[PDB]
Structure formats: structure tokens, C-alpha cells
Design a protein around this ligand. Structure first.
Ligand SMILES: C/C=C(/C)C(=O)O[C@H]1C(C)=C2[C@H]([C@@H]1OC(=O)CCCCCCC)[C@@](C)(OC(C)=O)C[C@H](OC(=O)CCC)[C@@]1(O)[C@H]2OC(=O)[C@@]1(C)O
Ligand code: NA
Length: 994
């Protein structure tokens, strides 16, 4: 299981000690199969519904909630009185809620899918090998392939493993390594070894990656590595090894629950200490046996009171809606909880070409040599119009149109652009648009020749589906394409060997047309063509050439330049090994510079603006390209990552420079850096790591399995709509339009969603605070139960839910993008706000209790002991004479309850309004600022007037309320809250922190 790409063919055959013509012997197979194991990625482990549900009941609360769902049940039986056949509702409801929860988490999860599973889609079921127990190729199962045996792949096949190529049978071999990088452009493979043992896959020309597809040809190879040890296997490992933290909100709730618990227990502790007098004053009797059940049915109350039962639903329905929302804006957010984190993204690393630019090339300038005489040198710049690959456009000199043909240098420049190009143009009808075909930069070059027919061929008479490849075809018919030497990142260029067609252009017979990066070719040039003639390349002419090269690429034009040359006296055909991409740069020498061309990959409109929004938003933006550092920087300025006259030395690094740094300075570079030039393998991931050490919520883009490990690591991995499937599944969000702007657009929606989300949370949590107080007092004052869990529930699930989810639609602040990203470690409720709900809660806690204790004391329906003795209501049936003289069951009356509850409701529809803004007054932030909020409050109210007047329902708790005096009471009890808040809100002035 090697690094075969650097070893020779005999060396790999040697290593495994196998025969290219025989293959592994069954012994070797078992031996290998044992040592190396099977050729597959570890199985997927998805817990069962049992394992699910269990987890669904691991949340401290859901547990505490369930423990109480029992006590209620245990208490609901030991009732002993038949006239209580509704004692099972309380327990039944709880379990339903609990259940309903698990019902979701189990369905929700089961539908989501990991990327480590998507990877097993690239694993072909079958493979073709050659083993010693037969002469013809045996077609076995990938699973059983082994490191060392001889394999054969061909045109249609999915490469089953990391294979070193032994020999290519077909005249050529092409592979679609797109599932790795995303680009579908097939690549040519060879046999000769690659020296560098630390080489990037991109430069492993003699290797076949498990997962990729044979584009063209047929070849035979020896399996270097299998299973997890394969390029894709490694990635699976990384992605498995990566742990993704919990959304800060889930972090915050998990905390809330932890504490919510500690308090609850403490309350009990205190409650017990409040009634510790039942040790010194109580005597032996049968009365206390009925006091236990009290301390128990008071706990289950204490629970539903504490926990914000409805919250989970409100949230998930909010995020749900925001999702669908963002979707309309092209942001496909997979995984709801991310809508939160998305909103706090500190830094955004975006690939350039796909998203920041349009990836739509077009040549804007060209320049041939005009004259070289002495030290005097003169070029011949031009300008080409037309952004679309459309053949529609004009060449100009100093803005004045020109006939390309009137220049020699140009006709060659054109032929090269036409012959040394593997791309083409096509005109579809489905949308009458001129579409690219091959490589984006070449399909441009072709377009360039259509725009400058060096031969003036008549075309205006041709149809568009012909105007496509006209001027191009003519040049193709003036030279024969013997063959072409492909691009290789070492010599960074390419060429095509050609011969003329008959004696029509037998001028000098065989020619070699080469295109590539300027630096490279220009050195391999010993001559420069001054239009139809040649002169010894010299110092000046060179400086001049390069100078314009820097202006065009570093200047505001920010163009990519391709030097163009031709080898006039190419080596003889037979003297060239056309299958050892090493002697290519060699074959491409003693060249004659004919001209350079410049093209542009136009930034996107919204981009310039989006980049600005981020500045306002305090969100850092980092560009990641393939451009040479020089143009990388230029492009950053052009869009605003940098300022035209800003220093950058320490803010832009090239893939290599970054490596040349020590782990330390490597970390610094990241907090400051805003541009990464020619980034290699790891980098994206390594970069996300550092950004996180500085505790920054970071966004990352990418689209090939090559980027999956980074997309998974980043807080918000961003995949392209046009991206691969593995990328997408590895990401949190997917830009349906690959637009960088769609990213920002989202980050904004995120900040808006959370702000509202943030409030409707405090709203409900604050109520739960008061609810608990009411339950405490009720207990500390011995007073009869002012509120029942069943009621409490309904309140928290419906009467409080509706307005809460309405609050979700609170209008958005106008400076959401003018404030720095929010801090993950920011508490939802603290300091003065803690104090407010501390009070508001206390308010309702008293308010409610008293309204029940009012219907008892000082009321005109059921007058109880106004001397306050009502407190000992437990003592009544037996203690009938001792200070009673009346019916013993008024305490069990319903209206005193419907009171405490009606005040609750109203106070809640009130508090729900004190929520439209954290520190603004309602006279500044009127309640109608959210029509929904109001509309819902109404709906909640009519529902309340439904658990009273309907029939079955009223029995399930309470009775009714006297239109006035009783309802009027409710009002002179609740309404005051608004003032209490407004007053405390007003404290936003007696301290300026509005
Ligand atoms: C739900 C009801 C209650 C009564 C509760 O115990 O909530 C506490 C609690 C656990 C927190 C507190 C509650 O503290 C109290 O209300 C004081 C105790 C009085 C009761 C004693 C009766 C004799 C929150 C509710 O309220 C106020 C206003 O004081 C605010 C906040 O919660 C949030 O930001 C919500 C998190 C989503 C948390 O301080 C939180 O602790 C944390 O870690 C946070 C950051 O979570
Ligand atoms: Na992620």
C-alpha cells in the first residue's frame, strides 16, 4: 500500500511482487486481503428508533418533565373518588407532548443524511482484475480488490481504487476527476513516474483515483492502495474525525435547562423548609397522610410551570419559515439550527471564480510586436468588445475599429488561438444563447478568433448555429493537427504539432503552436515575430513585453494573460516521445514570441456591494483563488477587499508562502489575511482551524469532495448549486445561484431571524418565571392551588405560543447590518433585563395568586376567611366546627382558579406586547407595528373564551367568569403590567444604553 505515483512501474510490480501478465496468485490474494483488509469504507452506524427515542429523552428537561408525568399519573389513580374521571388528562397530555417531541426528532433525523454516506456512491460494485487462476480478465466486486493486483479499467468504468497506471492500451487515456475537484474537464494520464513524493493529486499524472471515471480510453494498472487508505478514503477519515459543536443557542438552552433544574430542586428544598413547622406543631393523627399528596401534586405543577413547554415548537416553526424565506433568496439552508449561526458569521472565505466572479471569459486586449530596431521597441495593443462568448464584437486600436487581417502578427495570433485550443462554441435554440463548450478560458480564445476573422471570410450570411465556429474552422483547415502536448502545471503551457494541408501553405511545413503563462513561455522564446518576419529576441523587447504583462494583470484591468508563440523549426516527428510529459517543456523551446492576450473574469455586480455590506457588518471577507498572488491582489482591490492604495504584504499570502511559515506565524497570517493565492490541498481546512482558534464563526465555500472536510469543519460550510453532491451534503447552506451575494443576503436574514427569535424566547421564558412564583406562593401560603398544570400547559402551548410565533415576525431593525456580528457567548437574558423579568415575573406570581385568593377573600360570590385563615383549608371536613360553619369544598371551586388564570392570560397578551422591543416604549413602538402579533393575541383570547363557554372543555378545568366585576377585576389586575414594564423600560434613559 504505497506512494506509487513516485515509484517506477517495475518498482511497484516489485514491491507487491506480482506479475503484470499473471496477476496475484490466490495465496497472495488471501495474504493481501488479510493484511490490507477489504476495499471499502467503514459501514454507517445509524442508531435505532430505540436509540433515537432514548436520546429524545436525554434532555434534562424532557426528563424532569417525564418524571412529573408519572407523579401526576400515580396521583391520578390514588384519587379514590369516582367523581374525578379527568384526573388522567394532566398525565395524558404531558406524555403526549413528550411523545410528540420524540415523534419528531425520530422522523426529522431519519430524513437528514451525512456526507460520509454520500461517499459510498462513488464505490463501484464491480471491478476488472487479472489474477493467476485464469488467463482472461475476471470481473469481481470492488469490495474484494486488493492492493497489488492488476486491474483493468476502460471508458465507462468507475475507478475502483487508487491505482498506479501500468500501461495504457488505448492511444490515450482520459479521466473525469470531477468528483474530486468539481471541474468536469477530463485529464490525460501517463505511465512515467512523478519524482516528488509529496506531490498533490493534481500532479499525479500516472495515477487513477478510486471514485473517478474513465473519460476516454483503456488502460491497465496495479492497485496501489485500497479502502480508507485511498485519496477518497483519507477524506472520509478526516470528515469522520471532525466534530461539529452545537449551535450557540442550543448551547444556551442546554445551560438554561441545567440551571432551570438546580432552581426547581432548590424551590422544593425551600418549600419544605417553609412548612418545617409541621414537625414541632403537628401531632399524631390521620390528617397529614393527606398532606403528602399535596407536596407531590404541587411538584408536577412546579414543573409544567418552570419548563417552557411550547418553546421547541415556536422555534422550529420560525426557522422553518425563515428557511423557506431564504430559499426565495436563493439560499438553500439544510439544517435549521444553522439559521442561527449563519447570522453570527465572523469571517467568510469565498472561492473566487465561481462565486465572486462570473466565470465568463472574454479577451479584452492583445498585443503583437510592431517593431524592434536597436533599443527602440514598439508593440501593438488592441481592445476587443463583447463579454458573451458570442461571436459578436469588434477589435480596436486606440478605440478605432480595425480589420484584423491588415496585420500579420494577428493572423498568427489567431491561428494559434484557433489551433492550440481544445474548446469550442455552440449556439443552442432552447434559449438562443451562445454557449461555451470546453474550458472557460479556451472557449473564450475561440470566440476571439470569431471576432477577428484574420481572413475576412464571409459570415453575415450564415445562420447562428454556423456563425459559431466559422473563422475558427477556416484556420483549422489550413493546418493539420498532428497532435497536441497537454498543459502541465510544471511548464504551465501547452502546444499542438501541426503540418499544412497540401502545397497551399507548405511554406515551412511543420509548426508548433504554444500557449501558456507568460513568464514561462517568454523564456522559452529566442525570437519575436515582427509580423511575418522574425528577429532575435532581445533585452528591451522582452522588458517591454513583460511590462505590459504586469500592467494588464496587476493594473485595474485585472486580466489573465497568455503568452503566445510558435516553434518554427520543431524537432522532427519521430524524434518526439508523445507520451512522456517531461520532454514537453523541452519540445517547447527555442520559440518565437508572437503575442500575448488578456481576458477578464468579471466580478459580479452585487459583489462589489455585498463586500461593502460586510464591512458595515463587521464581517471579514477572504478571497481564495488560483490566480497568481499579483492578480489575486489586483482583483481584491477591484472588488474592495483591499483599498486601491492599501498595503498588503502581510494580508495576502500564496499557498506556498503559507507553508513556508512556522505553525505560529501561520496562525497570525490568518487573523489578518484577506487573500490566498494558489492554495493547495489542506489549506482551506488548516485555515478554518486558525480562524476558529481566534474564536471566529467562519464561512467556507468549496464544491468538490476535495473540500468536504473543510466544509464540514467550518461553522457554516457553503456549497454551490452547481456543486457536487458530496460537497452539498457536507455543507450547511447551498447557493442555488453560486452567487457570493446570496451568502451575505443570508447572513442578514440570519441576524433578523435571531433578533425576533431572541425576543419570543424571553417572552415565554419570562412567563414561565412568573408561573413558578405563583406556584411557590401558593405553596408557601398554603393557599389552595391557584393554577393547575393542565391549565398552565394550554397557556404555554397555545395561549402563549400563538403570540410568540407571531413575535417572530417583528419588523426588522434598520441597522442589522451596521452592527458587528453578535457574540456567541452573549446571554439571552442578563443584568437589568434579568431584573425586569425578575420583577415582571414576581408581579404575575403575586397577581395570579391574589386573584384566586380574592375570589375567596373580599369577593361577592364565594366569601372565605377574610381573616386569612383560608390558609388552613386542608383542615375543614373534620375541623368543621372549629372556625368554619360552612361547606367544605368551596376551596375546590373553579372560578377562584379561572380568575388566577384569566389574569395570567391577559398579563401574557400584555407582556407579549412589552416584547415588541427590548428597550423601546409602546408609545414609540406601538403594538400595531406587528399586525400579526395583535391578530394572534385575539385568536388566543377567543380560544380562552373557548375553554370556558364550550361544554366538554370547561369541566377539564375551571367554570366561567362574570362578564363584569369578575372580568373587570382581571383587567384592573393585569393591564398594570404594561406600566410596570414601561417604567423599567424608561430606566433606559436614567442610564444611556438604549
Ligand atoms: C423558568 C423559570 C424559573 C423560575 C427559573 O428558575 O429560571 C432561572 C434560570 C434557570 C435562568 C434565569 C432564572 O432565574 C430566576 O428567575 C431567579 C429565580 C427565582 C425563582 C425562585 C422561587 C422561590 C432567567 C430565565 O430569568 C430571569 C429573568 O431571571 C434568564 C436566563 O435565561 C435565558 O436567557 C433563557 C435561555 C434560553 C438565565 O439566567 C437562566 O439561567 C441561565 O443560565 C440563563 C442565562 O439561561
Ligand atoms: Na460545517
Amino acid at each position: 500500500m504505497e506512494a506509487a505515483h513516485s515509484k517506477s512501474t517495475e518498482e511497484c510490480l516489485a514491491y507487491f511482487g506480482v506479475s503484470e501478465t499473471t496477476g496475484l496468485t490466490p495465496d497472495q490474494v488471501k495474504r493481501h486481503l488479510e493484511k490490507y483488509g477489504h476495499n471499502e469504507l467503514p459501514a454507517e452506524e445509524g442508531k435505532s428508533l430505540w436509540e433515537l427515542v432514548i436520546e429524545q429523552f436525554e434532555d434534562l428537561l424532557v426528563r424532569i418533565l417525564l418524571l412529573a408525568a408519572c407523579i401526576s399519573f400515580v396521583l391520578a389513580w390514588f384519587e379514590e373518588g369516582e367523581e374525578t374521571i379527568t384526573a388522567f388528562v394532566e398525565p395524558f397530555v404531558i406524555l403526549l407532548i413528550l411523545i410528540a417531541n420524540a415523534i419528531v426528532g425520530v422522523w426529522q433525523e431519519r430524513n437528514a443524511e451525512n456526507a460520509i454516506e454520500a461517499l459510498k456512491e462513488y464505490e463501484p460494485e464491480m471491478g476488472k482484475v487479472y489474477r493467476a487462476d485464469r488467463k482472461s480478465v475476471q470481473r469481481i466486486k470492488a469490495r474484494d480488490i486488493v492492493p497489488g493486483d492488476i486491474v483493468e479499467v476502460a471508458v465507462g468504468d468507475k475507478v475502483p481504487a487508487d491505482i498506479r497506471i501500468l500501461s495504457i492500451k488505448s492511444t490515450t487515456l482520459r479521466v473525469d476527476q470531477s468528483i474530486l475537484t468539481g471541474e468536469s474537464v477530463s485529464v490525460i494520464k501517463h505511465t512515467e513516474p512523478v519524482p516528488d513524493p509529496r506531490a498533490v493529486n493534481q500532479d499525479k499524472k500516472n495515477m487513477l483515483f478510486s471514485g473517478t471515471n474513465i473519460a476516454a480510453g483503456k488502460a491497465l494498472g496495479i492497485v496501489a492502495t485500497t479502502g480508507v487508505s485511498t485519496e477518497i478514503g483519507k477524506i472520509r477519515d478526516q470528515m469522520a474525525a471532525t466534530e461539529q459543536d452545537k449551535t450557540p443557542l442550543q448551547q444556551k438552552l442546554d445551560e438554561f435547562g441545567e440551571q432551570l433544574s438546580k432552581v426547581i430542586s432548590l424551590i422544593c428544598v425551600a418549600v419544605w423548609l417553609i412548612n418545617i413547622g409541621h414537625f414541632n406543631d403537628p401531632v399524631h393523627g390521620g390528617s397529614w397522610i393527606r398532606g403528602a399528596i399535596y407536596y407531590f401534586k404541587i411538584a408536577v405543577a412546579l414543573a409544567v410551570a418552570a419548563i417552557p413547554e411550547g418553546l421547541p415548537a415556536v422555534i422550529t416553526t420560525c426557522l422553518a419559515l425563515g428557511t423557506r424565506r431564504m430559499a426565495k433568496k436563493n439560499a438553500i439552508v439544510r439544517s435549521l439550527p444553522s439559521v442561527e449561526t449563519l447570522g453570527c458569521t465572523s469571517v467568510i472565505c469565498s472561492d473566487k471564480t465561481g462565486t465572486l466572479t462570473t466565470n465568463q471569459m472574454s479577451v479584452c486586449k492583445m498585443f503583437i510586436i510592431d517593431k524592434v530596431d536597436g533599443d527602440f521597441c514598439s508593440l501593438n495593443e488592441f481592445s476587443i468588445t463583447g463579454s458573451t462568448y458570442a461571436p459578436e464584437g469588434e477589435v480596436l486600436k486606440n478605440d478605432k475599429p480595425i480589420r484584423s487581417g491588415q496585420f500579420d502578427g494577428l493572423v498568427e495570433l489567431a491561428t494559434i488561438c484557433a489551433l492550440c485550443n481544445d474548446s469550442s462554441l455552440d449556439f443552442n435554440e432552447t434559449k438562443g444563447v451562445y454557449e461555451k463548450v470546453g474550458e472557460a478560458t479556451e472557449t473564450a480564445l475561440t470566440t476571439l478568433v470569431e471576432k477577428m476573422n484574420v481572413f475576412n471570410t464571409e459570415v453575415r450570411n450564415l445562420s447562428k448555429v454556423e456563425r459559431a465556429n466559422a473563422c475558427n474552422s477556416v484556420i483549422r483547415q489550413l493546418m493539420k493537427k498532428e497532435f497536441t502536448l497537454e498543459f502541465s502545471r510544471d511548464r504551465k503551457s501547452m502546444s499542438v504539432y501541426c503540418s499544412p494541408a497540401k502545397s497551399s501553405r507548405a511554406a515551412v511545413g511543420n509548426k508548433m503552436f504554444v500557449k501558456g503563462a507568460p513568464e514561462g513561455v517568454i523564456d522559452r522564446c529566442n525570437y519575436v515575430r515582427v509580423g511575418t518576419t522574425r528577429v532575435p529576441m532581445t533585452g528591451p523587447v522582452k522588458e517591454k513585453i513583460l511590462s505590459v504583462i504586469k500592467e494588464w494583470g496587476t493594473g485595474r484591468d485585472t486580466l489573465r494573460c497568455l503568452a503566445l508563440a510558435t516553434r518554427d523549426t520543431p524537432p522532427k516527428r519521430e524524434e518526439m516521445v508523445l507520451d512522456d510529459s517531461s520532454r514537453f517543456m523541452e519540445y517547447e523551446t527555442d520559440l518565437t514570441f508572437v503575442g500575448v492576450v488578456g481576458m477578464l473574469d468579471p466580478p459580479r455586480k452585487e459583489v462589489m456591494g455585498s463586500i461593502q455590506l460586510c464591512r458595515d457588518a463587521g464581517i471579514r471577507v477572504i478571497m481564495i483563488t488560483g490566480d497568481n498572488k499579483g492578480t489575486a491582489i489586483a482583483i481584491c482591490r477591484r472588488i474592495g477587499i483591499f483599498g486601491e492604495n492599501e498595503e498588503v504584504a502581510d494580508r495576502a499570502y500564496t499557498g506556498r508562502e503559507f507553508d513556508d511559515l512556522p505553525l505560529a506565524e501561520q496562525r497570525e497570517a490568518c487573523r489578518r489575511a484577506c487573500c490566498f493565492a494558489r492554495v493547495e490541498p489542506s489549506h482551506k481546512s488548516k485555515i478554518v482551524e486558525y480562524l476558529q482558534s481566534y474564536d471566529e464563526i467562519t464561512a467556507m465555500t468549496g464544491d468538490g469532495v476535495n473540500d468536504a472536510p473543510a466544509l464540514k469543519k467550518a461553522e457554516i460550510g457553503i456549497a454551490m448549486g452547481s456543486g457536487t453532491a458530496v460537497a452539498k451534503t457536507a455543507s450547511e447552506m447551498v447557493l442555488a445561484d453560486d452567487n457570493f451575494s446570496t451568502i451575505v443576503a443570508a447572513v442578514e436574514e440570519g441576524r433578523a431571524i435571531y433578533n425576533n427569535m431572541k425576543q419570543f424566547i424571553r417572552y415565554l421564558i419570562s412567563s414561565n418565571v412568573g408561573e413558578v412564583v405563583c406556584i411557590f406562593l401558593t405553596a408557601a401560603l398554603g393557599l389552595p392551588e391557584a393554577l393547575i398544570p393542565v391549565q398552565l400547559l394550554w397557556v404555554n402551548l397555545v395561549t402563549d405560543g400563538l403570540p410568540a410565533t407571531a413575535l417572530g415576525f417583528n419588523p426588522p431593525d434598520l441597522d442589522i447590518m451596521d452592527r458587528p456580528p453578535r457574540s456567541p457567548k452573549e446571554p439571552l437574558i442578563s443584568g437589568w433585563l434579568f431584573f425586569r423579568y425578575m420583577a415582571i415575573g414576581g408581579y404575575v406570581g403575586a397577581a395570579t395568586v391574589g386573584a384566586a385568593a380574592w375570589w375567596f377573600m373580599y369577593a361577592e360570590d364565594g366569601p372565605g376567611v377574610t381573616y386569612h385563615q383560608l390558609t388552613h383549608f386542608m383542615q375543614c371536613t373534620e375541623d368543621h366546627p372549629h372556625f368554619e360553619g360552612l361547606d367544605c369544598e368551596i376551596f375546590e371551586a373553579p372560578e377562584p382558579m379561572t380568575m388566577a388564570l384569566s389574569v395570567l392570560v391577559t398579563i401574557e397578551m400584555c407582556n407579549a406586547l412589552n416584547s415588541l422591543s427590548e428597550n423601546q416604549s409602546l408609545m414609540r413602538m406601538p403594538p400595531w407595528v406587528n399586525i400579526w402579533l395583535l391578530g394572534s393575541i385575539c385568536l388566543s383570547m377567543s380560544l380562552h373564551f373557548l375553554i370556558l363557554y364550550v361544554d366538554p372543555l370547561p369541566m377539564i378545568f375551571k367554570l366561567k367568569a362574570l362578564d363584569l366585576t369578575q372580568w373587570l377585576m382581571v383587567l384592573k389586575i393585569s393591564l398594570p403590567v404594561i406600566g410596570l414594564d414601561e417604567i423599567l423600560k424608561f430606566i433606559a434613559r436614567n442610564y444611556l444604553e438604549g
